Design a protein around this ligand. Structure first.
Ligand SMILES: Nc1ccccc1C(=O)O
Ligand SMILES: Nc1ccccc1C(=O)O
Lengths: 344, 346
């Protein structure tokens, strides 16, 4: 394989042969690709439209260079809650993660300080006083003692540094933005995974299907990279190596239609302020979206070893997510997470 | 307002740039302010999007504003270029070098523009023949005036393009940057035979020349050659007086035999030099035929600066003028005069 051959193939709008994405990504991860080559590849792959096989190779090679968590420290039924980027919804996924954990589902998240290739989220967490830059042993302790952990992308994926510098220099989202959810170093087997583009959502669902995974890959039909409350969403429901694609409408559960501007995030501080209000009981469109997506992560979680059917799973998910907020469990778990970070 | 996220986002979404965006990107590239990653991302995105004539005219215009000019009134008004944008992984540099010699020998001033090859080429072959290729503006002008031909060495006239050129080499694949050689000839000839390996990009190039009111034939071999082929038919965009006629072209209607592609190609410096010596020395075959065909196209384009003459008799007179330049010895002699001029510089 070679760069001229792989880039020529992509610029001719052709899918790569098996192994070529892996080769390129391995060159990128070993420091052997020049910044222009990295950029050429990211852009051409994006514009051809990557396939599920191509993205599985990129993600798999990247994972092979990553630091794992210590053996048998990630509970088997841990979940992730994340979007690949819009505008963004770090507000919504951060809050949903905290609520899911407060409902008793172990959560392991993965991200970087924005505007980053592997999703943001770390900034907002820092602004809440959470300690984001912890190493495997302590993320593991966090998970066992608080029920949630955060894997800081720069410490678990040091070899991704060359890709990430290119991603920053070019500014525009590429195929690399799909990698965050697919390269969580804790390897959770369940999750709610949002994406801003329907074709790329389907591609991610194909990657998760080939893993031992119970995941809802979600795309708001307004462009949101989470389940939306402004209209329908499309969901690629992934289990047992298959995909059940469906149109989802939260009006079915009593959610009023909101406006798009009402859901979008802000900076770290605005996001922290919003986390505090929602976890404190403030009702409105943001809470609703948080409850919707948390329930979504819970339904994905139930798919790992529950027999429960879609609608009953959703109804129980909504009840558990709401109760985690209304009982103060979410507020308390966030306080407990902050405490854990300070108590080192 | 322009930024790399804005421009790159627009291109990756398959959208044409807004007016002024391509110019801004090129100015960043030319001043050294673009990161290699931004340069590569731009070249690749623009290529897969499919550039427009407007976008390419902005790129070329900015590049030219950074170039070194030839001195005032040293370039004949009716000078021509003969060049292709790079064969589709197939070497046709030999042809355009020979055609240029033959065109100049027919009395039409020729000013070429290229680099040492695998980076437009042609310079390596000329060096192997004894031509001094790396000369400053005054000496190119004097070459044009005393010999009737000159060569603008790209690294000399376009030094601020080195950032882009390093990126183009690093990625290997052809991009929109490959269209720039013929559109940034520092002598700014107003006529030419310009070959392109891709039909869609040839048509784009013709729009840029049309906008400049150049008299050009942009040519695409229907076998993918960036030159008029004898292997099959060719598409030609006839550009004169700001408008563009697209035509099919069959060399068989002038009596030319069908050749094999493997015949019209050939490798490195010393073998290309030997092929030039043979053709100018009068050897017949497909190489001579392709040379005569392309020289004739340049002569037709040159005529288009004056006349808007009838197509077929323009070509017959061009084919005759090109054949005679060889068979009189005028072409072999012009090459000798060119080599002699270079040796007088010391
Ligand atoms: N996103 C990353 C992943 C790994 C190493 C460095 C980075 C970085 O932010 O530069
Ligand atoms: N092709 C070129 C044109 C101008 C300047 C440098 C180069 C170069 O090869 O580095």
């Amino acid at each position: 394989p070679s760069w001229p051959q792989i880039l020529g193939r992509l610029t001719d709008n052709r899918d790569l042969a098996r192994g070529q994405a892996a080769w390129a990504m391995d060159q990128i991860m070993t420091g052997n690709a020049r910044p222009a080559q990295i950029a050429a590849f990211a852009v051409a792959m994006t514009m051809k439209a990557p396939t599920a096989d191509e993205v599985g190779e990129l993600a798999g090679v990247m994972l092979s260079h990553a630091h794992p968590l210590p053996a048998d420290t990630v509970p088997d039924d841990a979940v992730d809650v994340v979007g690949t980027g819009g505008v963004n919804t770090v507000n919504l996924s951060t809050m949903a993660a905290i609520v899911v954990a407060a409902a008793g589902v172990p959560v392991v998240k993965h991200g970087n300080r924005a505007a980053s290739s592997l999703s943001g989220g770390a900034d907002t967490l820092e602004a809440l006083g959470v300690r984001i830059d912890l190493g495997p042993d302590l993320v593991a302790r966090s998970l066992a003692e608080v029920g949630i952990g955060f894997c800081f992308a720069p410490r678990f994926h040091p070899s991704y540094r060359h890709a990430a510098a290119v991603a920053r220099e070019i500014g525009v989202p590429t195929v690399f933005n799909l990698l965050g959810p697919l390269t969580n170093p804790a390897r959770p087997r369940a999750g709610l995974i949002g994406c801003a583009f329907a074709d790329l959502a389907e591609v991610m669902a194909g990657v998760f299907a080939a893993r031992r995974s119970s995941v809802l890959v979600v795309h708001g039909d307004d462009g949101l990279d989470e389940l939306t409350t402004t209209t329908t969403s499309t969901i690629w429901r992934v289990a047992a190596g298959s995909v059940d694609k469906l149109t989802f409408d939260p009006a079915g559960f009593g959610f009023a239609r909101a406006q798009l501007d009402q859901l979008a995030g802000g900076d770290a501080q605005a996001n922290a302020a919003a986390v505090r209000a929602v976890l404190g009981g403030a009702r409105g469109p943001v809470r609703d979206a948080v409850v919707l997506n948390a329930a979504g992560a819970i339904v994905a979680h139930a798919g790992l070893s529950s027999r429960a059917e879609w609608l009953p799973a959703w109804e129980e998910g909504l009840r558990r997510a709401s109760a985690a907020i209304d009982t103060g469990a979410a507020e308390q778990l966030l306080a407990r997470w902050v405490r854990f970070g300070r108590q080192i």
